[PDB]
Subunit: 21 residues, 3 copies
Amino acid sequence: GPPGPPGPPGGPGPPGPPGPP
Amino acid sequence: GPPGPPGPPGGPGPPGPPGPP
Amino acid sequence: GPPGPPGPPGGPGPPGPPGPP
């Protein structure tokens, strides 16, 4: 048969890095 | 035949931005 | 049929922690 529909989106990425001083 | 299953879940997004100074 | 395409990447991650004093 034909392929299914796309999977769902992933979750958010990792937290960003600490800010500078 | 019927459609296949939905695709697998997507992966994570990119890392977030830096924190505030 | 076969599985659908993988889902898309998630959105950007959250901001990082505040920087040091």
